[PDB]
Amino acid sequence: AVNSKYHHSCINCGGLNTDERNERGLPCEVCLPEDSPSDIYRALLERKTLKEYRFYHEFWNEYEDFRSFFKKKFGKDLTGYQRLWAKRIVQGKSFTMVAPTGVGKTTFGMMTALWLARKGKKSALVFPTVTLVKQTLERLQKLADEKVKIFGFYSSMKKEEKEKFEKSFEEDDYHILVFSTQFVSKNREKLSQKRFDFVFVDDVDAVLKASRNIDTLLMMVGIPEEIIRKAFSTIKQGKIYERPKNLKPGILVVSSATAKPRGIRPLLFRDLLNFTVGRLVSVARNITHVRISSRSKEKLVELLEIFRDGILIFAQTEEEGKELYEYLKRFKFNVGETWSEFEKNFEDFKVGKINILIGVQAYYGKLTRGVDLPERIKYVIFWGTPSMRFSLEELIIPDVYTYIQASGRSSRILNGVLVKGVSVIFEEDEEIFESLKTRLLLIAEEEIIEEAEANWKELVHEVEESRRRSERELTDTSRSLLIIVESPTKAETLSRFLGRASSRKERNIIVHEAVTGEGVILFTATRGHVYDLVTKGGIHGVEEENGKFVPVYNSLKRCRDCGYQFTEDRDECPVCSSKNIDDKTETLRALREISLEADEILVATDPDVEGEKISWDVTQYLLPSTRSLRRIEMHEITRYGFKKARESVRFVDFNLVKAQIVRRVQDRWIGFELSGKLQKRFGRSNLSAGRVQSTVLGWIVEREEEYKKSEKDFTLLVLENGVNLEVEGKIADDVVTVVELQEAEEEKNPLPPYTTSSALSEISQKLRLGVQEVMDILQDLFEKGFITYHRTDSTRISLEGQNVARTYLRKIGKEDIFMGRSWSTEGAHEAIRPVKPIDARELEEMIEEGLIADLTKKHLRVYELIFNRFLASQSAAVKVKKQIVTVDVDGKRMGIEQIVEILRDGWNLFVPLTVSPRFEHRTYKIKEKKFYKKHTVPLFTQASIVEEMKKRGIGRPSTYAKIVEVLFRRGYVYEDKYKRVRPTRFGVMVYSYLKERYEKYVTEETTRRLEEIMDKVERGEEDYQATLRLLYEEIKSLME
């Protein structure tokens, strides 16, 4: 803990509680003054302070009662998938069973119905087919007690069987009803009046066929007809309906999402029952892609004699497919086709009558996407890369989405086991194949290896053994994992490589669900910070107990209309009086509710000081509710980045948290005191955001005097055969004489990769954009998985990063200039570099063709600079021919150094290296002289302010853009025609007022000295409490 107090963090009364008690799982001392109690529930019951811990205590008892009941009846312990479902059942929440097909899905509904029937609650189990109704009817009767009465109805039973069901239904003397989906449609009026506590639907597709069936299910759990129709009108309008809090509906469980729901009706569950009937897209696949450089029929036969069975061959056209079918029939092969007759040939393939099935590639084709048989489909062979026509000119480009679908027929999570698949591409066109690889990397992050790299014996064994494990009763190892991030953009990027299987509306936040080989994975975004320093009490929100400063935090509130943020517990916005407020208190409560359902929770906030503060705020809040809390940091939002983050899973680093607190307190104490004085003078609030802002504003103000005084005379000299020369003063001689010419050869090393400061400066200058706009683009690229983390002070490039450059250079055929460089060895982050070997031009083509659409032209131009800068650092040095020439102009000697020839191309392929016309040891006539004035000391630019902050040791990678932009927003600094920053008249007076009274507190030496100390606090070298005393002594002096 960091000895901090958080509002609404107590798990028993919802009041203020310290982080030390939250870390130990204890409530606030008002509820329980004891430090080491045996049982928290008994302690609160003893003192009669038990308010909300009762709900938690019942939850764990109910789950164990369900868990023990499951073990007694079924004889097997709850699986990982069923652990998540059981906890949602006892909380009275409707959900879609996000899981692969299996017997555990149907048996869980049977156990829940029996468990609810034991306490007297009625259940209704709905099944698609009559045969499934009978099977579950006899399975329930064997295990249920004689006191539990179960009745079913179908069209195949005798009239005596029907009559006893109808008698019981009207008598309402039943516990579990097992009827078909057709019964719902033909008896929706009678079922609407009856209310059930648990409804289980084995097949959602049957319900989706009839629009009335969806409304009937909602009425079964107690939702009134008026609410359903009004919500549907709101959904059709476009808005999101709000479920009234007085409504307590039953549990509705959808067994399997089948990606079929396309109408607008299924969205009713999202607003009325807080769960989404998902369009299950399972991005989970284990496929080895191998490319054979030739398209010879002889090599196809040799490959088919290794796989020998369960092979699909996808041809580009029907004519080519017929050609392969007859060639594979001349040679003795059990081969079929799917164009003249599909159902018979596929059935023969399924039963083993046919070993090889040939089809024609097509997007959403019946063989490409329609079939689902990973048990039989093991090897997928493409006779030519699947291609599509783009634009009116019918450009032929690879169709990666068809390739993903067709290759996906051989790999999915089957019976809880992700079976292995092999995809083989016969392609001779290198340009088509290389285009396919980049698209597959961008979309699926799957590589395609060459024929020599592949080992067919290993792949066949890997294919056979994986299906062997799916056929047998697997021991359950599945777990439910919760990933907590702060950015919605990161969550959307995660869902693209994890799968947006289903969504749950949990108070403010939306919790997504996905299926992996390890089980379910949940991920949600908190939408920014959760806690912030309070305003009133103590020293500007910081109390002082026992000689130590205890920060006091409250949940952040953001007005959705005007965007104003505040921490006070209010019903309306302080600025516009709007009640539409995004309160992080509801976000925190939702996280606590979800923490009970997940087996383990990982807080994947950004890997910096501010992200660590957010992680500990969430961690300490959820600790009283769960113990499986750990911290991971993703340096790139990709499958690889997620894997690497989990490989180095850790706990919260309190050194980083303390660094954020001292940096926040310094801004709060300096800012509020200075703003208070400035408010009395200039009538504006928040005129001082901190100490660094005033120091930078000082530089811009001082630059006016330095820019004016440095005004010197200059003359531009153009020469007969030569370069333009800048020389001081007025030049009267009409010739320039070379007195010494020195020419030699040199090797030019490239510049290091981008850091935050260097990327901001160079990109802003070249693209004519503000540093804040560039920073936001950098954040967008990182959170969308295109570059590494953009808040870094290091040039370090890992071996993986160097491999990225090598892969691109091999792709373009320029690997002879590859020069892997690690650059720095220190640093908690890599430099800003692309994560995939895809240049900007390739990315723009993908955007134009619709593969991705989340990048604008400014994003591409920023990415281009990052890509070329990084690959320049990973490219060979360029050998040049340079000359050093001494010239005499108006009797005074001047030195000129220039490159005149490039002898060996290197990194200049990515960052051009300009050459100049060669000089000779002779006299040069002057064609024309241009007379002008230039200032020796130039005006500051947004790029050069970041450079100055870096070299003067003030500012951080997380604050460089903010410091510059705040000066603009406060009205202190403006930009002229040439994008040079200058102080406004108001900005001058603000700095003048501060210099006369508070210059010592805002001078650069003080700013740098405090920055160095707070850096050591981050590294654990300076004490956290001692640093706060240093600030407290300083602010006490300036309050006089």
Ligand SMILES: [Cl-]
């Ligand atoms: Cl490394």
Ligand SMILES: [Cl-]
């Ligand atoms: Cl930082």
Ligand SMILES: [Zn+2]
């Ligand atoms: Zn309490």
Ligand SMILES: [Zn+2]
């Ligand atoms: Zn507002």
